Amino acid sequence: GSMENFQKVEKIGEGTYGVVYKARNKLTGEVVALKKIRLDTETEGVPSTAIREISLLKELNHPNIVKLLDVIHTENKLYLVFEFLHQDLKKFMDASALTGIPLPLIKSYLFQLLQGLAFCHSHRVLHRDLKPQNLLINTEGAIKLADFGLARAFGVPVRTYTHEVVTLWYRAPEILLGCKYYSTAVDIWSLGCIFAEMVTRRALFPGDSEIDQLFRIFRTLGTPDEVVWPGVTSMPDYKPSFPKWARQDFSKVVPPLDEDGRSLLSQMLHYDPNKRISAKAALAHPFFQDVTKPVP
Amino acid sequence: GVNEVPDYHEDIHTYLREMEVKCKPKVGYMKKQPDITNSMRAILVDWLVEVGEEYKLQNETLHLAVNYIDRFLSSMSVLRGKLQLVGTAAMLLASKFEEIYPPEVAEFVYITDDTYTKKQVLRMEHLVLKVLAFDLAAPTINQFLTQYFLHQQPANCKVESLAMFLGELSLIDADPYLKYLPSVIAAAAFHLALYTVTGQSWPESLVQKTGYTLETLKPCLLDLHQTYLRAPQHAQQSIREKYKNSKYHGVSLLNPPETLNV
Ligand SMILES: NS(=O)(=O)c1ccc(I)cc1
Ligand SMILES: NS(=O)(=O)c1ccc(I)cc1
């Protein structure tokens, strides 16, 4: 396309790979977000992270995944044209800090996140960076997965992919304990952590280091064992010294949440990757039998 | 096991089958290339094999590169002295897509023996991205092979290696192999590797997965059996050398069966 039909409106964000602007198509009226990715034309070429994001988003056409609308090329820059959405879930929860977030809106948003995610998994794409700042809402009650920067197309069965993946707080315990293979579950874990956070508006496991991240999960969910999580004690970064914490009651962890909520959450936060619910399965869960789509 | 994505293996398979049709190159592109030939390409692909071993790259990366090249050359006429530039750039992109720790651009300039400048490699990178329109997530022979291995009961390392090896043999020869989809080559390769080491044949469970019977795999099976048999005498050997190693259970030193008994 052409960068002459876009009128820049403001910088809505930035990142290691460039700045994000909000823009207006002068000819159609459409409002967009422009990701400008600088090209290292003498050194490293197009960033692997952009190559993945563009390639993958080009394949993921679903109403709960952010839409890449165009990629405009120069010799020296790449501009990604995305649909503009009003804000991210992080910003929203921080502004709903006192008013609170209505339960049917939470249920809607989770339901949509799961629909979006199930599409990724159905299309052999891991996201590996689900967290509130990467989830975009609009004014009509829609939410969408965004920032496929760290995503990866996967094979069946999975192989060793980058370990340095997922913000710590949203990082599943199989990565923490340092296993070779991870899969669709790591995404579900994150959404579990997100589910909890939508309800309490506090982060569920806000750890300041790796060992700390593990302790925070174990105090809340009970230190795993071989009867909960076969294979845990033989994990690379497992340490038999870990204190033996009694599992906390989900009605302390998420007081506002109903019995069905607590069930879905627990299945999302299962220690065992193999036993953790699928996005596909979670969509059937009885928590959603009465879902609607309210506006924020 | 979630590493086999139980709730998705089917949805994924269905999708790869539909996507492999869309990433498929034009079967007779070399006829329309006025200055390059199946032999020249064979040399290129064979060299990519070497590169993959020197930099210890995933086999998936090699497969992606060859996908990139064939689609590129389905759309762009290229002179012989630029064939390698196209090759290098495709390998670079494949690596950035697929590898945890891809080699730096510098390294790719190093292996063309400074045939090209770094700047040529990077500008070719951009061109290849533009030509393919960033449709890089190509289903490969390997992506089908791994999914097929799951039907083994139990798994046999020698079957896995031999099928991988037979898959890579196909990369080299656009004639005939450009006329088979990946999932077809992959099946033929798996049937042929399994038949060789065990005596068994295409599982009925894979028939039920793929819709591919032996009847449907026969044309491909015939071509591939012939490749396997003539393999020691091929002009390109890098793949045979690669699969002599203990890494791949030395399946290339295994003597091929003489008939496939229909
Ligand atoms: N990170 S991204 O490019 O997916 C994106 C960020 C913000 C908006 I609004 C739309 C897209
Ligand atoms: N790279 S490109 O210009 O071929 C392209 C076009 C449209 C989309 I959506 C993504 C990429």
Common-topology check for domains B11-24+138-262 and B25-137: yes
Under DSSP, the state recorded for B3 is G
State the DSSP H helix or E strand holding residue B40, giving kind and residue range, or none if neither: helix B38-54
The CATH number assigned to the domain with range B11-24+138-262 reads: 1.10.472.10
What are the phi and psi torsion angles at B164 (to 5°)? Answer: -60, -50
Decide: residue B14, CB within 10 A, 0-12 exposed, 13-18 middle, 19+ buried.
Answer: exposed
Cis peptide before A63 (omega within 30 of 0): no
**Closest to A274 (Cβ–Cβ): which among B2, B102, B105?**
B2
Specify the 3-state DSSP secondary structure of A185. Answer: helix
CATH number at residue A107: 1.10.510.10
Q: Based on the domain organization, do A79 and A103 belong to the same domain?
A: no
Specify the 3-state DSSP secondary structure of A65. Answer: strand
Query: What is the rounded CA–CA span in Å between residue B93 and residue B8?
Result: 27
To what resolution in angstroms was this structure determined?
A: 2.6
CATH number at residue A64: 3.30.200.20
Side-chain-side CA neighbours of A185 within 13 Å: the count stands at 25
Other beta carbons within 10 Å of A190: 25
Query: What is the rounded CA–CA span in Å between residue A157 and residue A153?
Result: 12
Per 3-state DSSP, what percentage of chain A is helix, strand, and coil (rounded to 5)?
Answer: 35, 20, 45
Query: What is the rounded CA–CA span in Å between residue B170 and residue B141?
Result: 10
Side-chain-side CA neighbours of A285 within 13 Å: the count stands at 23
Decide: residue B259, CB within 10 A, 0-12 exposed, 13-18 middle, 19+ buried.
Answer: exposed
A20 has binding-site annotation: yes
CB of B134 shorter than 6 A to ligand 2: yes
What residues of chain A, 230 to 249, have a C-beta less than 8 Å from chain B? none
Query: What is the rounded CA–CA span in Å between residue B198 and residue B251?
Result: 13
Side-chain-side CA neighbours of A130 within 13 Å: the count stands at 28
Amino acid at B221: L
Q: How far is the CA of A33 from the centre of ligand 1 (A)?
A: 6
- CB-based contacts of A255, cutoff 8 Å, min separation 6: none
Decide: residue A5, CB within 10 A, 0-12 exposed, 13-18 middle, 19+ buried.
Answer: middle
Which two structure tokens, joined as six digits, stand for A159?
Answer: 């192989």
Q: Based on the domain organization, do A146 and A184 belong to the same domain?
A: yes
Q: How many residues does chain B have?
A: 262
Domain encompassing residue A139: 87-296
Residue carrying the six token digits 């692909």: B45
Q: Based on the domain organization, do A248 and A296 belong to the same domain?
A: yes
CA distance B261 to chain A (A): 31
Closest residue by CA, ligand 1 atom 11: A82
What residues of chain A, 29 to 68, have a C-beta less than 8 Å from chain B? 39-48, 51-52, 54-56, 58-59
- B66 close to B45: Cβ distance less than 8 angstroms: yes
What residues of chain A, 166 to 205, have a C-beta less than 8 Å from chain B? 181, 183-185
State the DSSP H helix or E strand holding residue A69, giving kind and residue range, or none if neither: strand A68-73
Contact residues, chain A, for B121 at CB < 8 Å: 45
Q: Based on the domain organization, do A104 and A52 belong to the same domain?
A: no
Experimental method of this PDB entry? X-ray
Query: What is the rounded CA–CA span in Å between residue B101 and residue B164?
Result: 23
Residue where a domain stops, chosen among A63, A86, A109: A86
CA distance B233 to chain A (A): 34
Residue carrying the six token digits 């996967």: A154
Q: Based on the domain organization, do A46 and A115 belong to the same domain?
A: no
Active site residue A129: yes
Q: How far is the CA of A51 from the centre of ligand 1 (A)?
A: 16
Strand positions, DSSP E, A84-190: 87-88, 125-126, 135-137, 143-145, 152-153
CA distance A45 to chain B (A): 6
Of A60, A32, A35, the closest CA to residue A47 belongs to A35
Contact residues, chain A, for B13 at CB < 8 Å: 156
Which two structure tokens, joined as six digits, stand for B11?
Answer: 């949805």
Q: How far is the CA of B91 from the centre of ligand 2 (A)?
A: 21
State the DSSP H helix or E strand holding residue A81, giving kind and residue range, or none if neither: strand A77-83
Q: Going by CATH, does the domain composed of B25-137 fall within 1.10.472.10?
A: yes
Residue where a domain stops, chosen among A86, A117, A150: A86
In whole angstroms, what separates CA A108 from the centre of its chain?
A: 16
Query: What is the rounded CA–CA span in Å between residue B182 and residue A196?
Result: 43
Contact residues, chain A, for B125 at CB < 8 Å: 45-46
Q: Could you tell me which chain B residue has the CA closest to the CA of A155?
A: B143
Strands of the sheet with A135-137, listed across from one edge = A87-88, A135-137, A143-145
Domain coordinates of chain B in residue numbers? Answer: 11-24+138-262, 25-137
Q: How many residues does chain A have?
A: 296
Q: Taking the alpha carbons of A244, A215, A230, A274 in that order, is the dihedral positive or negative?
A: positive
Q: Based on the domain organization, do A105 and A64 belong to the same domain?
A: no
